């Protein structure tokens, strides 16, 4: 219809380490365009576009506002990291659910594609590998991306083209830090 | 080159305001998962996970103060920019189950809509081309680095052979509302 406009404001705390190095960046967005940006490495509000020149200057002529924003690196980022975030994110535990599926079967001696579904897990460094009779396979392997379920859990699907005889058994192997020893799911033909 | 890597990253509050219509929104997200958000008119902090609210507490009055200052920021910007155009983008949807599909066992179907701009979208569900609304959850609008937004909807359903489910999306940047059909097996 007529003129519509969208505005956005955000302030990100980058934690490269635990409590050693913290970084703070505030961003102002107008119509999917950023026009004012503050960085903890800079120390003052800079205009990423010319439109944000006077606004950032208003935040550069006020010493109390600048000192407050500089102190927000410890009062907003570090304070939340050492308190609530350590007590609500590290404490949240998970366990991956690993199942096995098959698109097509028939005699199974022909070409086939085995599926390993690892669902309902909190995202972390996972090493998923296909094993045929104990030996790892890499050819014909196709795994989906990290699928964000949006409810704190994640999901992933891995696929292996399994051609060999029914007499052999296949197995899916996943390595997730929330589980001490890697769970191993086996499927018989 | 534009992306910088960190061990953990938290937005600690995202403010979105749209004019006209006075569309406000204020959330709280960390490392991808939404910790909680702040209701607009109810003046209360709504946690995505109930256990998360048993250990931390956020003051929603600061939420209303920041959404009001964002309103003022957009107001003075639209008054100073005079005649500037705004663009629209068509979103893309993807339907997938939450847990592995087992026929006869209750499951949750998720409809993920990415590249939403502007964040004004109707996400509905249809069961066998029929209107259904039994336990339809909708998360808040997560933010992407493209300054677009991605939301997720939930439907608790029973997978059966006589039922086919589709997710319908109605957007301002879509010439017609698009429907993604889905039938397991």
């Amino acid at each position: 219809s007529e003129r519509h406009f969208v505005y956005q404001f955000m302030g990100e705390c980058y934690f490269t380490n635990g409590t050693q190095r913290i970084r703070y960046v505030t961003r102002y967005i107008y119509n999917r365009e950023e026009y004012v940006r503050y960085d903890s490495d800079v120390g003052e509000h800079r205009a990423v576009t010319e439109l944000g020149r006077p606004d950032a200057e208003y935040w550069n002529s006020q010493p109390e506002i600048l000192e407050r924003t500089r102190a927000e690196l410890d009062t907003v980022c570090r304070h939340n990291y050492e308190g609530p975030e350590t007590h609500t994110s590290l404490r949240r535990l998970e366990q991956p659910n690993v199942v096995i599926s098959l698109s097509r079967t028939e005699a199974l001696n022909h070409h086939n594609t085995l599926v390993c579904s690892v669902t309902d897990f909190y995202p972390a460094k996972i090493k998923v590998r296909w094993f045929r009779n104990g030996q790892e396979e890499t050819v014909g392997v196709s795994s989906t991306q990290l699928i964000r379920n949006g409810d704190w859990t994640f999901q992933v699907l891995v696929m292996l083209e399994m051609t060999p005889r029914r007499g052999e058994v296949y197995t899916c192997h996943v390595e997730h830090p929330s589980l001490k020893s890697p769970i191993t799911v086996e499927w018989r033909a | 080159e534009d992306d910088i890597e960190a061990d953990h990253v938290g937005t600690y509050g995202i403010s979105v305001y749209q004019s006209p219509g006075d569309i406000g929104q204020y959330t709280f997200e960390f490392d991808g998962d939404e910790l909680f958000y702040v209701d607009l008119d109810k003046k209360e902090t709504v946690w995505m996970l109930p256990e998360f609210g048993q250990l931390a507490s956020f003051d929603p009055q600061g939420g209303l103060q920041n959404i009001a200052v964002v309103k003022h920021n957009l107001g003075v910007l639209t008054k100073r920019s005079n005649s500037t155009p705004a663009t629209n983008e068509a979103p893309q949807a993807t339907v997938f189950p939450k847990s592995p599909v087992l026929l006869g066992q209750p499951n949750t179907l998720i409809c993920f809509v990415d590249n939403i701009f502007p964040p004004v979208i109707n996400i509905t569900w249809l069961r066998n081309s029929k209107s259904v609304a039994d336990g339809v959850y909708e998360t808040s609008f997560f933010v992407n680095r493209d300054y677009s937004f991605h939301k997720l909807s939930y439907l608790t359903f029973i997978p059966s052979d006589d039922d086919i489910y589709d997710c319908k999306v109605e957007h301002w940047g879509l010439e017609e509302p698009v429907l993604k059909h889905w039938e397991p097996e």
Binding site: F9, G11, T26, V36, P54, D55, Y58, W59, I65, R68, T69, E72, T75, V76, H79, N80, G83, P84 | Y12, G13, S15, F28, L55, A56, S57, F58, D59, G62, Q65, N66, V69, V70, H72, N73, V76, L77, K79, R80
Partner: peptide
């Protein structure tokens, strides 16, 4: 005593 410590997010304001 255990408390629900959680620091708020602080925005800013321009004049224009």
């Amino acid at each position: 005593g255990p408390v629900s410590k959680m620091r708020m997010a602080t925005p800013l304001l321009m004049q224009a």
